[PDB]
Amino acid sequence: ASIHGIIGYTITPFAADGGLDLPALGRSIERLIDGGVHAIAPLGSTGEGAYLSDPEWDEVVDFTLKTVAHRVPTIVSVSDLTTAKTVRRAQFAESLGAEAVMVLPISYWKLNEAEVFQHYRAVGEAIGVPVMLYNNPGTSGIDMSVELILRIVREVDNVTMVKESTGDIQRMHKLRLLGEGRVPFYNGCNPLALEAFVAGAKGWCSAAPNLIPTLNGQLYQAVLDGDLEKARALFYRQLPLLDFILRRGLPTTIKAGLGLSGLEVGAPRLPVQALDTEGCRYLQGLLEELR
Amino acid sequence: ASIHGIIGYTITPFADGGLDLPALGRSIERLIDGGVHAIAPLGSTGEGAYLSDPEWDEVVDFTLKTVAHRVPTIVSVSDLTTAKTVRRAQFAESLGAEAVMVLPISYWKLNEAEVFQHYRAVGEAIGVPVMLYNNPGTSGIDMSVELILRIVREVDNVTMVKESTGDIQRMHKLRLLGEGRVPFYNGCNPLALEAFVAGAKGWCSAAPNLIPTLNGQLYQAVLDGDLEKARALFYRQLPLLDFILRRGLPTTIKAGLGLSGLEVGAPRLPVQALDTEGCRYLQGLLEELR
Amino acid sequence: SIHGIIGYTITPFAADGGLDLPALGRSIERLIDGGVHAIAPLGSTGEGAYLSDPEWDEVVDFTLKTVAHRVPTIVSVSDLTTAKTVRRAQFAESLGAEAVMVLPISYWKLNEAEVFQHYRAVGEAIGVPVMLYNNPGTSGIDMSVELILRIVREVDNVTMVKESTGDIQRMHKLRLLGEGRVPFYNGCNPLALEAFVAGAKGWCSAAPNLIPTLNGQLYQAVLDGDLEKARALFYRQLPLLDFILRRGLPTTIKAGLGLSGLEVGAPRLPVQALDTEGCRYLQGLLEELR
Amino acid sequence: ASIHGIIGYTITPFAADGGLDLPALGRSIERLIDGGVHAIAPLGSTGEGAYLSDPEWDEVVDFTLKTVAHRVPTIVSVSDLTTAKTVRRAQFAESLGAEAVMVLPISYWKLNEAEVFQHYRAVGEAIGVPVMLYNNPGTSGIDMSVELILRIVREVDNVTMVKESTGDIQRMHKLRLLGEGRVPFYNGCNPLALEAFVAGAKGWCSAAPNLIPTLNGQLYQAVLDGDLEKARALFYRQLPLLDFILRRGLPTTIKAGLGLSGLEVGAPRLPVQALDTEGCRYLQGLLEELR
Ligand SMILES: [Mg+2]
Ligand SMILES: [Mg+2]
Ligand SMILES: [Mg+2]
Ligand SMILES: [Mg+2]
């Protein structure tokens, strides 16, 4: 079950009572699979995973995996503050059929390289499925060097993949060189989708497939076809929307976008606010011109 | 009761992995005996974020009971969701907290409107003062002085501001733009001296766990307006403050307490206990202070 | 027309430390034989800022004469004052320069209004195109895309934009906001591949002094739309591009030419010549690419 | 003669015809001395040193030293791109009686620690007067660690003083601790004037004395008197002006300020522009408030 191409981040719809709206989540999942995504990645920032209580988190994982029905690989974000809880969530995700889990070293205080390494070792040694190492300083507060990342990949059996969202293309260049092309890496930063693929990215994790699965998939196809000129055209066409998502927030824009697409998924959980009227109209236009 | 001077951050001892409340009680007594003007539980020092909800609730209750209002207690109630932050603020208040501290935590940027409303929600839910805490290094959110002042003036219960950016200019602005009416507090150890001279009303630190005497003397020297003694006292303790910063609060404080006759275990993974080499260096720093 | 591989020239010095024009001539011949599409003299690579006014004037003259218009020449006339920048731009034009490049160098921040008039003054003072060059790392000034676009659209002679921030997003924005009308060039070696794919019309580099073949091949592959071949070619030469940036342009390029049978001396102090270790590593890198 | 207290940066007035206005420069120097500065520092950023031709630079040095008539020490900024020219300027300054020189490692291209050390070594060994090592990454593009600075100071005889303009008070803490209080350091960052003195700075180099020498001097005196309360008050009273100078630029605000103070000194050299009407209005208000 190769993990590649367009990997769709799922959102977490909330019901009026503020609780989970699973039915809506199932529809969004079906919308993604039919949109032609190559995998599903639940409980990331897009899904406001960190806003969920433990019961809610468990329920979302369960429902998502049951819904997907192994039609495409599922990579669950199991990142948490403590090693114990990260391990526990990784084991839980595996027990329900997750093909892989993603681990970002989130922390409020700085972690040293030894502490980061052991964190990944503990998670990998506790499970039987692959772990995707996720480097995102902007959100986690930690910035792992390519050297450290490569040591974790080599020394930790289950750590096999690397996602980069630093926005710094040089990180992927170093991964390619120092990894000698044997360490598969993935793109996590939307505005760099084109460059990421050109640099050799095996896949692109994004919430955009929630709104424009077709354009996203065409970009990946163009790269596979080695069509440099077409890929550029496709990228610049969808870039504005990509910039807007980063600009106004993932869950904020995605949930609003799905709402405009006739799919009621409610609003984000406070303190995150729903897209305002002005932003909603602008998004409306962006989507109409892309369609 | 005025919140001022030396405000001691408590650590959270762990036993078997669970809480070691008896050890916590002992550490709290030390701090109060040590002359702290207030207690601040469940901050970064106390690894608050590593605690389960049940553990957090337990620590809050136990801490408040132990202190027994001998000094003011300001509880860190910050959490990701507004709903949870509000709940923790009300919980702390109901259990006797004199004040609460709120830091806008988020694994993704929040806009000024989202931040402002976050504080408004918390302030309106309680009847005790809120200390607004700006620490982008640990929170990922950096609030401008202008925004901070808007929150202080518009939200009744938000009355105090803690700065931990390490950027003294933030305090200068708070001083000028707030026209000296907005009390601010220092949360950055290596800036203790400058913060006080800039007008800081208090200093929130975990250092009192190890050197409560030098900490208190620095504050007193400032109160006495004795610039030269203050400078001397600060530089004498600076090396230790620098070390705490480089090697981590919970890591260094828990290690240091072990050297001071108080076993409090190790930090919670992925944070690791101070290594042998670091521990030896710490022993040297404390000796030299002596 | 400026496109493809624009080769930055170095400025050879004799043992004494003075100009070595013969060697410069040989290096220019190596570049043109190498297949460069343009020559860019007196940039950072050429240690332009290190030259006296007389030395600078002579290098420009000798360069333009040696080239004999076989390929376009774009002279870097950037200087601190507007008056001297204008003078240098006119001197270059009077000697046949096809165009000039202007970077807003300053030892103190300049405001957007000051930057704009600087370019306006230069543009209105000459009759050849001006390439606006944004390089914060080497200038101390970072021009916004909107500012750059405002200068290009309002200043007749300002027609081209060079980006050296290493931030691909700047080029994306130049593409969208410029609507594909504003031709931009890459000035950052390790971004050659991405820059071309993003829409870069040319790549100004000192690398052509060492590996003009691999350089041109990368450009040609992009012209053909061969994404895979381009990637392979880029990564093959990247190690060298990384080394140059890490050890210094003039330092590595002068050491490289030495190992390429073209003695060009060392950099002008305080810049030091490549050391033994770095020299052996560069030697290994080159032998592998050839 | 000790270099301490308030060291006044001079501006370089230009005549209507673009050339040097020596009479105006003389008047500004007298104003500084009468204002109670403890030293004069010509040809820094305040004086637009880098904007001057060689003949102009030489003349300003000559005229300045003659005007001062050794009433107070003069520390000339001799920093230049090449080691050769920096040495020449240092020697020229000394030949005309300069008490000391200041050296900042200017470089468009980055420089390594070895290159920086040798630069100072060359300058120090070429002259017979003290050198003030000046760290200002914001201007030079180079950021010398305190460790490197202390090595230079210890190993190069004539390098005896350190000026810090990073705005990072911790650098001064390190200089005091690692230097064991035997390496005199100076403040070059206006809005850090109070903290620098509190940290133990021996002197403060500023262009502010051109406008408010009295308040500048009073702050220093309060620090000497150990009066924490008064020092704080004096600093905050003048901070708005210090903030403004930094925000609007040295030559710009200083030359505009002197004009508002009855001393016509022309405008800065392009690309630097004169203070705008709105700025002049604000500045006039600040000065009237302080006087
Ligand atoms: Mg592995
Ligand atoms: Mg209030
Ligand atoms: Mg134009
Ligand atoms: Mg010395």
mmCIF file of N, CA and C in Angstrom, chain B residues 66-163:
data_model
loop_
_atom_site.group_PDB
_atom_site.id
_atom_site.type_symbol
_atom_site.label_atom_id
_atom_site.label_comp_id
_atom_site.label_asym_id
_atom_site.label_seq_id
_atom_site.Cartn_x
_atom_site.Cartn_y
_atom_site.Cartn_z
ATOM 1 N N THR B 66 -2.682 23.530 50.426
ATOM 2 C CA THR B 66 -1.379 23.619 51.077
ATOM 3 C C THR B 66 -1.004 25.063 51.402
ATOM 4 N N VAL B 67 -1.087 25.934 50.400
ATOM 5 C CA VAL B 67 -0.761 27.344 50.584
ATOM 6 C C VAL B 67 -1.620 27.967 51.682
ATOM 7 N N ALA B 68 -2.878 27.545 51.751
ATOM 8 C CA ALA B 68 -3.793 28.019 52.788
ATOM 9 C C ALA B 68 -3.832 29.542 52.867
ATOM 10 N N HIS B 69 -3.728 30.186 51.709
ATOM 11 C CA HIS B 69 -3.844 31.638 51.607
ATOM 12 C C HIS B 69 -2.800 32.403 52.417
ATOM 13 N N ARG B 70 -1.672 31.759 52.699
ATOM 14 C CA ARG B 70 -0.560 32.439 53.350
ATOM 15 C C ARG B 70 0.035 33.458 52.384
ATOM 16 N N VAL B 71 0.012 33.112 51.101
ATOM 17 C CA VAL B 71 0.358 34.038 50.031
ATOM 18 C C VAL B 71 -0.620 33.823 48.887
ATOM 19 N N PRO B 72 -0.749 34.817 47.998
ATOM 20 C CA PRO B 72 -1.640 34.677 46.854
ATOM 21 C C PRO B 72 -1.176 33.562 45.926
ATOM 22 N N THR B 73 -2.125 32.829 45.358
ATOM 23 C CA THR B 73 -1.810 31.805 44.374
ATOM 24 C C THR B 73 -2.401 32.197 43.029
ATOM 25 N N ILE B 74 -1.562 32.196 41.999
ATOM 26 C CA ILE B 74 -2.006 32.525 40.652
ATOM 27 C C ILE B 74 -1.852 31.309 39.747
ATOM 28 N N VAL B 75 -2.977 30.691 39.404
ATOM 29 C CA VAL B 75 -2.969 29.427 38.677
ATOM 30 C C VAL B 75 -2.940 29.619 37.162
ATOM 31 N N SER B 76 -2.047 28.894 36.495
ATOM 32 C CA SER B 76 -2.006 28.874 35.038
ATOM 33 C C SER B 76 -3.128 27.988 34.511
ATOM 34 N N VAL B 77 -4.122 28.606 33.887
ATOM 35 C CA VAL B 77 -5.303 27.881 33.439
ATOM 36 C C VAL B 77 -5.352 27.791 31.920
ATOM 37 N N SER B 78 -4.294 28.265 31.271
ATOM 38 C CA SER B 78 -4.222 28.258 29.817
ATOM 39 C C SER B 78 -4.464 26.866 29.253
ATOM 40 N N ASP B 79 -5.277 26.797 28.205
ATOM 41 C CA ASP B 79 -5.432 25.573 27.434
ATOM 42 C C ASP B 79 -5.759 25.935 25.989
ATOM 43 N N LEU B 80 -5.848 24.929 25.128
ATOM 44 C CA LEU B 80 -6.039 25.163 23.700
ATOM 45 C C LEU B 80 -7.407 25.761 23.372
ATOM 46 N N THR B 81 -8.467 25.120 23.853
ATOM 47 C CA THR B 81 -9.822 25.594 23.589
ATOM 48 C C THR B 81 -10.236 26.658 24.592
ATOM 49 N N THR B 82 -11.079 27.586 24.149
ATOM 50 C CA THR B 82 -11.650 28.582 25.045
ATOM 51 C C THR B 82 -12.491 27.892 26.116
ATOM 52 N N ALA B 83 -13.329 26.954 25.688
ATOM 53 C CA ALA B 83 -14.212 26.241 26.606
ATOM 54 C C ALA B 83 -13.443 25.637 27.777
ATOM 55 N N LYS B 84 -12.316 25.000 27.482
ATOM 56 C CA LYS B 84 -11.505 24.367 28.517
ATOM 57 C C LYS B 84 -10.780 25.393 29.385
ATOM 58 N N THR B 85 -10.280 26.452 28.760
ATOM 59 C CA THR B 85 -9.610 27.516 29.497
ATOM 60 C C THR B 85 -10.580 28.159 30.483
ATOM 61 N N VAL B 86 -11.798 28.418 30.018
ATOM 62 C CA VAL B 86 -12.844 28.965 30.872
ATOM 63 C C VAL B 86 -13.150 28.023 32.030
ATOM 64 N N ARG B 87 -13.265 26.736 31.726
ATOM 65 C CA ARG B 87 -13.580 25.741 32.742
ATOM 66 C C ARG B 87 -12.500 25.694 33.822
ATOM 67 N N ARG B 88 -11.240 25.694 33.400
ATOM 68 C CA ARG B 88 -10.125 25.661 34.342
ATOM 69 C C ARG B 88 -10.046 26.924 35.196
ATOM 70 N N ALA B 89 -10.378 28.066 34.601
ATOM 71 C CA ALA B 89 -10.391 29.328 35.334
ATOM 72 C C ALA B 89 -11.449 29.313 36.436
ATOM 73 N N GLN B 90 -12.645 28.844 36.097
ATOM 74 C CA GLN B 90 -13.733 28.759 37.067
ATOM 75 C C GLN B 90 -13.434 27.719 38.143
ATOM 76 N N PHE B 91 -12.813 26.617 37.736
ATOM 77 C CA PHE B 91 -12.442 25.563 38.672
ATOM 78 C C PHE B 91 -11.446 26.099 39.693
ATOM 79 N N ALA B 92 -10.406 26.765 39.200
ATOM 80 C CA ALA B 92 -9.390 27.348 40.066
ATOM 81 C C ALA B 92 -10.005 28.362 41.026
ATOM 82 N N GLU B 93 -10.885 29.211 40.506
ATOM 83 C CA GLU B 93 -11.539 30.220 41.332
ATOM 84 C C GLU B 93 -12.381 29.581 42.433
ATOM 85 N N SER B 94 -13.177 28.584 42.060
ATOM 86 C CA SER B 94 -14.058 27.914 43.009
ATOM 87 C C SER B 94 -13.267 27.259 44.134
ATOM 88 N N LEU B 95 -12.029 26.877 43.838
ATOM 89 C CA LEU B 95 -11.179 26.214 44.825
ATOM 90 C C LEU B 95 -10.353 27.192 45.665
ATOM 91 N N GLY B 96 -10.449 28.482 45.353
ATOM 92 C CA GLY B 96 -9.845 29.511 46.198
ATOM 93 C C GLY B 96 -8.737 30.355 45.590
ATOM 94 N N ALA B 97 -8.461 30.165 44.304
ATOM 95 C CA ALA B 97 -7.383 30.903 43.650
ATOM 96 C C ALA B 97 -7.615 32.414 43.704
ATOM 97 N N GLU B 98 -6.571 33.162 44.052
ATOM 98 C CA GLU B 98 -6.652 34.620 44.104
ATOM 99 C C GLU B 98 -6.638 35.223 42.705
ATOM 100 N N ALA B 99 -6.045 34.498 41.764
ATOM 101 C CA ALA B 99 -5.940 34.969 40.391
ATOM 102 C C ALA B 99 -5.593 33.821 39.457
ATOM 103 N N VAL B 100 -5.769 34.046 38.161
ATOM 104 C CA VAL B 100 -5.406 33.049 37.163
ATOM 105 C C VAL B 100 -4.537 33.680 36.086
ATOM 106 N N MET B 101 -3.768 32.847 35.396
ATOM 107 C CA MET B 101 -2.888 33.315 34.334
ATOM 108 C C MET B 101 -3.250 32.645 33.014
ATOM 109 N N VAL B 102 -3.333 33.442 31.953
ATOM 110 C CA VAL B 102 -3.784 32.937 30.663
ATOM 111 C C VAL B 102 -2.808 33.246 29.532
ATOM 112 N N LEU B 103 -2.339 32.186 28.881
ATOM 113 C CA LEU B 103 -1.479 32.285 27.711
ATOM 114 C C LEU B 103 -2.212 31.681 26.519
ATOM 115 N N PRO B 104 -2.274 32.418 25.400
ATOM 116 C CA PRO B 104 -2.981 31.933 24.220
ATOM 117 C C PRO B 104 -2.221 30.818 23.504
ATOM 118 N N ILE B 105 -2.427 29.579 23.941
ATOM 119 C CA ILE B 105 -1.768 28.427 23.333
ATOM 120 C C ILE B 105 -2.456 28.023 22.037
ATOM 121 N N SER B 106 -1.662 27.660 21.034
ATOM 122 C CA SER B 106 -2.207 27.248 19.747
ATOM 123 C C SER B 106 -1.140 26.623 18.852
ATOM 124 N N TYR B 107 -1.478 25.494 18.237
ATOM 125 C CA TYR B 107 -0.580 24.840 17.291
ATOM 126 C C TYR B 107 -0.769 25.430 15.901
ATOM 127 N N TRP B 108 -1.442 26.575 15.856
ATOM 128 C CA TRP B 108 -1.645 27.323 14.624
ATOM 129 C C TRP B 108 -1.984 28.760 14.988
ATOM 130 N N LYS B 109 -1.496 29.705 14.193
ATOM 131 C CA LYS B 109 -1.668 31.116 14.509
ATOM 132 C C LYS B 109 -3.132 31.490 14.717
ATOM 133 N N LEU B 110 -3.370 32.382 15.672
ATOM 134 C CA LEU B 110 -4.688 32.957 15.880
ATOM 135 C C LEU B 110 -4.608 34.440 15.544
ATOM 136 N N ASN B 111 -5.678 34.988 14.977
ATOM 137 C CA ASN B 111 -5.709 36.414 14.672
ATOM 138 C C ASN B 111 -6.042 37.237 15.913
ATOM 139 N N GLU B 112 -5.787 38.539 15.847
ATOM 140 C CA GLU B 112 -5.995 39.417 16.994
ATOM 141 C C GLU B 112 -7.428 39.374 17.517
ATOM 142 N N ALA B 113 -8.383 39.191 16.611
ATOM 143 C CA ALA B 113 -9.788 39.114 16.996
ATOM 144 C C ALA B 113 -10.066 37.835 17.781
ATOM 145 N N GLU B 114 -9.452 36.739 17.349
ATOM 146 C CA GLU B 114 -9.631 35.451 18.007
ATOM 147 C C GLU B 114 -8.980 35.441 19.386
ATOM 148 N N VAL B 115 -7.830 36.097 19.502
ATOM 149 C CA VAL B 115 -7.137 36.200 20.781
ATOM 150 C C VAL B 115 -7.925 37.063 21.761
ATOM 151 N N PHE B 116 -8.340 38.240 21.305
ATOM 152 C CA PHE B 116 -9.091 39.162 22.149
ATOM 153 C C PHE B 116 -10.338 38.501 22.724
ATOM 154 N N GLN B 117 -11.076 37.791 21.876
ATOM 155 C CA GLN B 117 -12.307 37.136 22.302
ATOM 156 C C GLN B 117 -12.024 35.999 23.274
ATOM 157 N N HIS B 118 -10.858 35.377 23.128
ATOM 158 C CA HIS B 118 -10.445 34.304 24.024
ATOM 159 C C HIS B 118 -10.340 34.838 25.448
ATOM 160 N N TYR B 119 -9.675 35.980 25.596
ATOM 161 C CA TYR B 119 -9.505 36.603 26.902
ATOM 162 C C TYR B 119 -10.816 37.174 27.432
ATOM 163 N N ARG B 120 -11.632 37.714 26.534
ATOM 164 C CA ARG B 120 -12.925 38.255 26.930
ATOM 165 C C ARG B 120 -13.782 37.159 27.550
ATOM 166 N N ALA B 121 -13.772 35.987 26.924
ATOM 167 C CA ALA B 121 -14.558 34.853 27.398
ATOM 168 C C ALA B 121 -14.128 34.419 28.796
ATOM 169 N N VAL B 122 -12.819 34.325 29.010
ATOM 170 C CA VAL B 122 -12.288 33.914 30.304
ATOM 171 C C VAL B 122 -12.588 34.950 31.382
ATOM 172 N N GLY B 123 -12.319 36.212 31.071
ATOM 173 C CA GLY B 123 -12.545 37.297 32.018
ATOM 174 C C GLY B 123 -13.983 37.384 32.492
ATOM 175 N N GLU B 124 -14.922 37.215 31.567
ATOM 176 C CA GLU B 124 -16.341 37.354 31.882
ATOM 177 C C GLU B 124 -16.885 36.165 32.670
ATOM 178 N N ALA B 125 -16.126 35.076 32.707
ATOM 179 C CA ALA B 125 -16.585 33.846 33.345
ATOM 180 C C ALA B 125 -16.186 33.749 34.816
ATOM 181 N N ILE B 126 -15.313 34.644 35.262
ATOM 182 C CA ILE B 126 -14.809 34.580 36.631
ATOM 183 C C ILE B 126 -14.893 35.921 37.351
ATOM 184 N N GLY B 127 -14.637 35.898 38.654
ATOM 185 C CA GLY B 127 -14.669 37.105 39.472
ATOM 186 C C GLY B 127 -13.319 37.431 40.077
ATOM 187 N N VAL B 128 -12.270 36.812 39.544
ATOM 188 C CA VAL B 128 -10.910 37.077 40.001
ATOM 189 C C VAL B 128 -10.054 37.599 38.854
ATOM 190 N N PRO B 129 -8.996 38.352 39.187
ATOM 191 C CA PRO B 129 -8.119 38.974 38.198
ATOM 192 C C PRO B 129 -7.453 37.956 37.277
ATOM 193 N N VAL B 130 -7.220 38.359 36.032
ATOM 194 C CA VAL B 130 -6.503 37.532 35.076
ATOM 195 C C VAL B 130 -5.173 38.175 34.706
ATOM 196 N N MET B 131 -4.101 37.397 34.800
ATOM 197 C CA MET B 131 -2.792 37.853 34.355
ATOM 198 C C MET B 131 -2.530 37.404 32.925
ATOM 199 N N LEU B 132 -2.571 38.352 31.995
ATOM 200 C CA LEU B 132 -2.282 38.057 30.599
ATOM 201 C C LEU B 132 -0.799 37.744 30.438
ATOM 202 N N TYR B 133 -0.506 36.623 29.793
ATOM 203 C CA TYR B 133 0.861 36.135 29.690
ATOM 204 C C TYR B 133 1.290 36.004 28.234
ATOM 205 N N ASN B 134 2.262 36.817 27.837
ATOM 206 C CA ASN B 134 2.791 36.769 26.480
ATOM 207 C C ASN B 134 4.117 36.021 26.422
ATOM 208 N N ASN B 135 4.103 34.856 25.783
ATOM 209 C CA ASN B 135 5.311 34.060 25.616
ATOM 210 C C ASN B 135 5.269 33.283 24.305
ATOM 211 N N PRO B 136 5.608 33.956 23.195
ATOM 212 C CA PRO B 136 5.581 33.339 21.873
ATOM 213 C C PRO B 136 6.500 32.126 21.800
ATOM 214 N N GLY B 137 7.574 32.147 22.581
ATOM 215 C CA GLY B 137 8.526 31.043 22.597
ATOM 216 C C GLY B 137 7.895 29.723 22.995
ATOM 217 N N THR B 138 6.935 29.779 23.912
ATOM 218 C CA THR B 138 6.294 28.569 24.418
ATOM 219 C C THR B 138 4.861 28.419 23.913
ATOM 220 N N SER B 139 4.274 29.521 23.455
ATOM 221 C CA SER B 139 2.876 29.518 23.037
ATOM 222 C C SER B 139 2.719 29.489 21.519
ATOM 223 N N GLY B 140 3.658 30.112 20.815
ATOM 224 C CA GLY B 140 3.586 30.209 19.362
ATOM 225 C C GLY B 140 2.824 31.442 18.919
ATOM 226 N N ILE B 141 2.301 32.183 19.890
ATOM 227 C CA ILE B 141 1.557 33.407 19.618
ATOM 228 C C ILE B 141 2.263 34.607 20.241
ATOM 229 N N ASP B 142 2.495 35.643 19.439
ATOM 230 C CA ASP B 142 3.159 36.851 19.923
ATOM 231 C C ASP B 142 2.213 38.048 19.888
ATOM 232 N N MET B 143 1.712 38.435 21.055
ATOM 233 C CA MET B 143 0.772 39.543 21.153
ATOM 234 C C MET B 143 1.485 40.889 21.213
ATOM 235 N N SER B 144 1.084 41.804 20.338
ATOM 236 C CA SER B 144 1.644 43.148 20.329
ATOM 237 C C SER B 144 1.236 43.885 21.596
ATOM 238 N N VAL B 145 2.028 44.877 21.986
ATOM 239 C CA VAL B 145 1.713 45.666 23.169
ATOM 240 C C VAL B 145 0.387 46.400 22.992
ATOM 241 N N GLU B 146 0.123 46.859 21.773
ATOM 242 C CA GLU B 146 -1.132 47.539 21.472
ATOM 243 C C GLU B 146 -2.335 46.632 21.723
ATOM 244 N N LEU B 147 -2.251 45.392 21.248
ATOM 245 C CA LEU B 147 -3.317 44.418 21.462
ATOM 246 C C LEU B 147 -3.474 44.118 22.947
ATOM 247 N N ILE B 148 -2.352 43.871 23.612
ATOM 248 C CA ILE B 148 -2.362 43.584 25.040
ATOM 249 C C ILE B 148 -3.088 44.677 25.815
ATOM 250 N N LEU B 149 -2.773 45.929 25.503
ATOM 251 C CA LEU B 149 -3.390 47.057 26.192
ATOM 252 C C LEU B 149 -4.880 47.175 25.876
ATOM 253 N N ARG B 150 -5.267 46.831 24.650
ATOM 254 C CA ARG B 150 -6.683 46.814 24.291
ATOM 255 C C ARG B 150 -7.429 45.801 25.153
ATOM 256 N N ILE B 151 -6.815 44.639 25.347
ATOM 257 C CA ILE B 151 -7.415 43.582 26.150
ATOM 258 C C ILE B 151 -7.523 43.991 27.616
ATOM 259 N N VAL B 152 -6.470 44.615 28.134
ATOM 260 C CA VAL B 152 -6.460 45.051 29.525
ATOM 261 C C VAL B 152 -7.527 46.110 29.792
ATOM 262 N N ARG B 153 -7.685 47.042 28.857
ATOM 263 C CA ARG B 153 -8.640 48.117 29.064
ATOM 264 C C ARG B 153 -10.082 47.700 28.797
ATOM 265 N N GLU B 154 -10.290 46.792 27.850
ATOM 266 C CA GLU B 154 -11.645 46.376 27.491
ATOM 267 C C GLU B 154 -12.188 45.207 28.315
ATOM 268 N N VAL B 155 -11.301 44.330 28.773
ATOM 269 C CA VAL B 155 -11.710 43.210 29.615
ATOM 270 C C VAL B 155 -11.436 43.521 31.083
ATOM 271 N N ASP B 156 -12.501 43.774 31.836
ATOM 272 C CA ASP B 156 -12.379 44.175 33.235
ATOM 273 C C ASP B 156 -11.356 43.348 34.009
ATOM 274 N N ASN B 157 -11.564 42.037 34.048
ATOM 275 C CA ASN B 157 -10.768 41.163 34.908
ATOM 276 C C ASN B 157 -9.306 40.972 34.491
ATOM 277 N N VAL B 158 -8.992 41.243 33.229
ATOM 278 C CA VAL B 158 -7.601 41.210 32.789
ATOM 279 C C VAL B 158 -6.906 42.479 33.268
ATOM 280 N N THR B 159 -6.085 42.348 34.304
ATOM 281 C CA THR B 159 -5.537 43.513 34.992
ATOM 282 C C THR B 159 -4.014 43.552 35.010
ATOM 283 N N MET B 160 -3.385 42.430 34.678
ATOM 284 C CA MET B 160 -1.934 42.317 34.772
ATOM 285 C C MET B 160 -1.342 41.722 33.502
ATOM 286 N N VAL B 161 -0.070 42.022 33.254
ATOM 287 C CA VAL B 161 0.607 41.530 32.062
ATOM 288 C C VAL B 161 1.984 40.957 32.385
ATOM 289 N N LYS B 162 2.207 39.707 31.990
ATOM 290 C CA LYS B 162 3.520 39.087 32.130
ATOM 291 C C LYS B 162 4.218 39.006 30.776
ATOM 292 N N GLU B 163 5.459 39.475 30.730
ATOM 293 C CA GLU B 163 6.258 39.427 29.512
ATOM 294 C C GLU B 163 7.428 38.461 29.653
#
